[PDB]
Amino acid sequence: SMPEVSNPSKPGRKTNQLQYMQNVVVKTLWKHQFAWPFYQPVDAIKLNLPDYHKIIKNPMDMGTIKKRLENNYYWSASECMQDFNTMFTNCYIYNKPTDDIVLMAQALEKIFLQKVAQMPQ
Numbered sequence: 001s002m003p004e005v006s007n008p009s010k011p012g013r014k015t016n017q018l019q020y021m022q023n024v025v026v027k028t029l030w031k032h033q034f035a036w037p038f039y040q041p042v043d044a045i046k047l048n049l050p051d052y053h054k055i056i057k058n059p060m061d062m063g064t065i066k067k068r069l070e071n072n073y074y075w076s077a078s079e080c081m082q083d084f085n086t087m088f089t090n091c092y093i094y095n096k097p098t099d100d101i102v103l104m105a106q107a108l109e110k111i112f113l114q115k116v117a118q119m120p121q
Ligand SMILES: Cc1cnc(Nc2ccc(C(=O)NC3CCN(C)CC3)c(F)c2)nc1Nc1ccc(Cl)c(NS(=O)(=O)C(C)(C)C)c1
Pocket: 036, 037, 038, 042, 047, 091, 094, 095, 099, 100, 101
């Protein structure tokens, strides 16, 4: 896929921090009532966003993040944080500050930031 969820040349593993990213960070956000627009890649056709992929060059979604964790794709929890930040930043870049999707992203980001601040090690 694009972005990729597997790469045979890239070292990957599951540390305590990556276990925390999966079992605490991703799983908590997945249960949130505002998380569903982020489970899958943005569908620019269904949503009538013809310029979406002209503006957003590094797409990211929580389904991709979940698969990366399931595949031991990451070496560092910092990479998982990067993916979340790409997802949030993409939302803030593309959309108007008043769009409901932006408020939904802000709610998830606050939980992401709180859980990351409490990550051990
Ligand atoms: C990840 C993501 C990033 N960006 C955007 N951008 C966007 C996507 C959709 C409109 C939209 O439909 N706005 C309507 C247009 C007509 N008006 C009358 C009312 C507002 C818009 F404004 C922005 N979406 C994303 N995912 C997403 C996935 C599923 C759905 Cl159903 C939606 N639709 S949504 O945003 O409207 C809702 C979640 C609040 C129902 C969005």
